[PDB]
RNA sequence: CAACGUUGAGUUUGGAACCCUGAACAGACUGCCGGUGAUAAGCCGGAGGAAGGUGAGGAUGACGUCAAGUCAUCAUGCCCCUUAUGCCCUGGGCGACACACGUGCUACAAUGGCCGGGACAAAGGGUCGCGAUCCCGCGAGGGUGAGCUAACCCCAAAAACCCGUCCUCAGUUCGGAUUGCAGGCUGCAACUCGCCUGCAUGAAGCCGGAAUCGCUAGUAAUCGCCGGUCAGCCAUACGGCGGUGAAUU
C-alpha cells in the first residue's frame, strides 16, 4: 500500500515549514514562483562549483523567509568546506545571482549559511552519499551497510533505508530495504526526517527513500 | 416540475431567474391570475 | 508537455501586452458609439490585431510542468506538483485538512 | 492606530502580538487588546494519483489568523516604539491610522 | 447485526393525545421526513372518524390494531435440503409493526381523494373487521395453518 | 362553448379552458382573461357579453390553422434552402445541437 | 441594435467584385460571416475543411451564416 | 451463432486487436458448445481478446483470452487463458468454462441433499 | 405591540437578567430570559404559536421543560434565536429553559435528569466524504 | 447587548453582564459504587456528568498481492524520426449515428401541481472583481454606480415548511421532450457546437420483466445554497454547507 510522506503527515505539530513567508492570495502564486526560481539557482550553482572541485556537498535544505524589506535565505548545509574555502565565498557569489533572479525593487537579499552539526543524522546528506557510492558501481549491499554504520556512529535512534530500481544493472527491477532500530511511522509525536532522492545510472533511474527517527 | 423553464421551480433549478422567478418585488411577473369571485 | 506549447503561450502573452490598451480603446469605442454603419469600420479595426492578441486566446498552464489541465489558480500549479510540494513543506500555510 | 496582524502559524502571530502589546505598554499608551478575528480557512482538494482513479483525493487547507490591536492615543514615543519593532518574517502587519 | 444487538429507544408520546400508538402511526406514515404534513393528515383522519361515528377514536385505534395484528406468520427455513415454510410465532412489537404496515399499505391503495379520508376509511373498516388489512392477516393465518405440519418446534 | 375558434373548451375554469386552442399557452390565456375581458368563472357560466368580448379578442391572435401553416412554411422554407437545420428536418435528426450517439428517441421514433 | 457579423477580407472582396460588376468565384474560410444582401447572385466556395464547395446565393440566404451551406461531416449509412 | 442461445448476450471485444470473420465464427463455435448445453442458466458471455509479443511488444507471442459468464442466479464465472494462437486460446477458455458451468449446475441443480 | 411588552418587561438587555439559559443544537442558538408571572412565549418579538407554526411537536418541545414541574402559569419566557431551522430553535429553547430553571432553584435537578432535558444534543450533520454521493450514500454500483 | 431615531443610517452613546470569535486551560481514565468472574483481563448494571466504555466524524493503509494503472502530468534506460514522426497558421475533428453497455437528472401527480401573502440557515467566494440605489425593458438584460482588499460592503432570492384562493382523478393546472418565431449576454468569431429570455408547440410516460444497487441515526429520504475550473459554458457532473427527518436488526 501507500504511506504518506512522513514530512507531510506532521505539519504544524512536530515539523516546521521551510518557506516561512505570507502573501495575499493573488501574490501567492508569484511568491511561490520566486521561491522556486531561487531554490533552483542556489542548487545549480553549488552543484556545479563543488562537483568541479571534487567533494561531497551536502545541501540539507533551503529555508526562505520573506520580509517586506529583506528576503533571507538560510542554507542548512553539512560540509561548507567547499563553499567557504573558494576565494569568491558562496555568500557574495550567490547573493549577486540570486538577487539578479527575483528582483531588486523593494527587495534586497541576505544569504546565511548554517552548519548542521551531524551530517549523517540527516537523511538528505546520507542519500546523496549512497547516490555517490552507487554511482561508483559499488554493490548496493556495501553501500547500505556503510550508510548504516556512519549513521549509527553519527548518533541516530532509528533508520529505514529503501532503494528501488534496476539493481546492479540486472534486467528485472526490484526493491531492497533495511530497517534498523525502531522507526514508528504512524506516531505523530515522533520526530521524523524523510528524504527522497533520484539517481541516474547507465541502467536508468534508481530511487532512494530514507527515514530517520530522532526520538519523541 | 423541476424541468420546466416556464415555472418558478424550474427556473430556480436551472439557476436562471426570469419572468417566472423575479429578482425583486418591483419586476413585473406574468399577467395576473388574481381574479376569482366565489360568493356564498 | 512540449516545449513549443509553452512558447506559443509566451508569444501570446507578449502580443496581448502590446495590443492591450488598443483593445480597451476600440472596445469602449464600439460600446459607447452608435451608428451601425460606423460600427462596421470600428469592427474592421477590431479584426485587424492578430488572433493571438485576444485575452480569450490565452491559456493558463502550470508553471513548473506546463500541464494544460488541472490548474488551481492561486498556486499557478497543477495538482500533482502542488501535492508533493505540500508534503515537502514548501507551501506556507498548507496543512492536510480534516474538518 | 489599529493594526491588523495576519499570519498562518499561531505561535508567531501571538508572540508578535506580545512584542507589540508590551512595546506599547512600556511607552504608556492605552491598548484595546489583541482582539481575535474569525479565522479564514480555505479548502482545496486534488486528485491523489496522476491518472485515472477519481476517488483518491487530497484535502489541504490554508488557515489564516487575524489579530487586531487597537492603540488608543499615539504618543511620539509610542509611534516610534511600534515603528521600530522587530516582527518575525511570517506575520503581516496592516496599519490603519 | 452479527455481533451487537439493539438497545431500546425512547418510546415517544403524540403531543395532543399523549399516546405511544398514535406516535407509532405518525412515524410510519412519514415520507421525506415532513412531520408537519403527517400530523395534519392523521389529525384530519381523527376528525373524519369522529365525524362518521360518535364512538371515541382513541378506542377505534385499539380495535383497528387488535383487529389486524397477526399472532403468527410463516418463515422460509432450509432444513435437510428441503425448503420449508415454518410457522414462526410473532413478537408483540413486530405484531404492532405488521399491523400499522398493512393498515397503511391498504390505506395508500384506496380509490379516494385525500390520505386522511383513506386512513379514516381503513381504520373504520379494520375496527369492524370489514376490510383488506384484516383479510390480509387472515390469509397469513390460512397459510400458517396449512403449513402447520412443518413446525417441529411445536 | 364551441364557438371560440371552432374548438371546445368544456366545463372548466376559463383560462385552462381557453388553452385548448392551438395557439394559446399560459400567457395569452391569463393576459386576455385578466386584462381585457376581466372576468373569471366556469365555461358554461359565461354570459353572452363576456363571450362576445372573448371571441373578438382571441380573433386577433393566430390560431390552429394559421399557426400550423405558419410553422409549416418556416420548416418548408428551411428544407428548400438546403441549410443544415433543413437537412436535419428532412433526415429526421436533432438540429439544436444535441448529440446523436444516444438519445434521439423522441425525434427518432418517426 | 448590435451589428451583424461579416469578415473584413470578404466584405472588401465582395465590395470590389460588386463594383466591377462581374460574377467570380470567391473562396472563403469564414463560416461565421453573415450573408449581407449586398452579396446575392454571387458564387461563394466555402471551406468544408478540405474542399471548397461552390454555393449560389439567393434572396432566401440573407440572415443566415455561411457554414450552414457547406456540410462538414461525410455520412452515408452503416 | 445459435437460436437456442438467442436469450444470451454474446459480447466480443478486441482489446488491442482487430477482429476478423474467422475469429467471429470460431468464437461462436467454441463458446457455442460451452454454453449451449447449459443455456437455461446462462445470461451474458463477455469475451475480451488481448494480443502481445512478436512485433507489438517484448516477450513471447502471447494471445490471451478472458471470458466471463453470468447466470440468471449466480454471477462471476471468470476464465483467463494464455497461449500461442487465438484459436488455441479460445479452445482453452471453452475448456475452462465448460468445467465451471457444469460445476454450478452440479452443485445447485442436483436436488443436492444439503442437510445443515 | 409585543415589542413594547418585551422592552418594558426587560430594561437590561438580554445579558443582565438573573435567570437566563442558552440552548444550542444543530446550527441554531437560542438565548432564554426567564421571568416570574402569568405566562407568555415570546420568540423573537413574536408569539410561540406564530413563529413555531403550531406544529404540535415543536410547541410541545418548548413547553415540556415546564410540564415536569407545573410552572406553566408561574413563568414568563422571552427568547431570541438565530441559526438553523425552526425545529432546532425549538430544541435550543427547550434546553435553555432547562438551564435557566436549574439557575433559579437547584431542587429541580432530579425531575429534569429523569426526563433527560439537561443534555446538549451532540448529533449534528455528518460531512460529505469524497467518492460518495452524500454521506454514507454510495453511487449506484454495477458488479458488471 | 441595550438606547436615540431611520431605512442610508450614525460611529452616536454606555455595558463586557448574554452571544460570538480564538487563545490558553480543565474534563472521560472502567476513574468511583454494586453485581459478576480462577485473584486476572474483562463482561451486565448504577451514580455523578454536556458527554461512558474506540463519546461522534476525519487524516491515518504493515510485510506483501495483482509481472494492476500511468513513458500523455513529471523524471528516465534503450530503440527510432530528424527538409520530417519536429515547428507556424486558418479551417475542420474530438460534438458523426442502425444499435448495444454503464453512471446520472426529470418524471408518471393530490404526502400533489399553480397563485398570493408571511418565517427560519450554514459555509463559502469577491479590486482587470463582487456590484447595492436609481432609471429604461413583460423579460433575460441595458444605463448609473454607492460600499467593500472583507465578522464592516456585495453575490443574497435560501428552498422545503405555514396561513389563505383555485384544480379533487383526467394523459389533466400532471409531465415536460421536441420544434418554430422573436431576442439577450460573453467573446475578433456562437452554422457545424455556448448559455440565458419572451410567445408558441405540447412526445413518451399511470411506479416499470428477469435481475440488481445504496443505507444502522442526524443516517436514509427529501429541500435548496456556495465553490473550484472559468471571457462564456455542455454542471443534472465533481468538492463542500446547512433545512426537515424516519422505519428495521
Ligand atoms: Mg508495503
Ligand atoms: Mg406544470
Ligand atoms: Mg442550464
Ligand atoms: Mg431570467
Ligand atoms: Mg420594470
Ligand atoms: Mg518533455
Ligand atoms: Mg479559456
Ligand atoms: Mg457470538
Ligand atoms: Mg443533508
Ligand atoms: Mg459539519
Ligand atoms: Mg463518480
Ligand atoms: Mg453533489
Ligand atoms: Mg460601546
Ligand atoms: Mg452509568
Ligand atoms: Mg474516537
Ligand atoms: Mg491509528
Ligand atoms: Mg506494474
Ligand atoms: Mg495498458
Ligand atoms: Mg519518450
Ligand atoms: Mg503526428
Ligand atoms: Mg487551428
Ligand atoms: Mg469527448
Ligand atoms: Mg460534429
Ligand atoms: Mg409561496
Ligand atoms: Mg466563482
Ligand atoms: Mg445591472
Ligand atoms: Mg402514451
Ligand atoms: Mg393518472
Ligand atoms: Mg449490497
Ligand atoms: Mg457500518
Ligand atoms: Mg464559470
Ligand atoms: Mg446528468
PDB file of C-alpha atoms (C1' of nucleotides) and ligand atoms in Angstrom, chain C residues 1-3, chain J residues 72-76, ligand 6:
ATOM      1  CA  UNK C   1       4.420  18.874 -22.260  1.00  0.00           C
ATOM      2  CA  UNK C   2       6.059  20.020 -25.476  1.00  0.00           C
ATOM      3  CA  UNK C   3       8.357  22.997 -25.176  1.00  0.00           C
TER       4      UNK C   3
ATOM      5  C1'   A J  72       0.178  11.978 -22.489  1.00  0.00           C
ATOM      6  C1'   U J  73       1.417  15.399 -15.843  1.00  0.00           C
ATOM      7  C1'   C J  74       6.939  14.982 -14.098  1.00  0.00           C
ATOM      8  C1'   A J  75      11.806  12.201 -14.422  1.00  0.00           C
ATOM      9  C1'   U J  76      14.274   8.400 -17.169  1.00  0.00           C
TER      10        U J  76
HETATM   11 MG1  LIG K   6       9.111  16.680 -22.212  1.00  0.00          MG
END
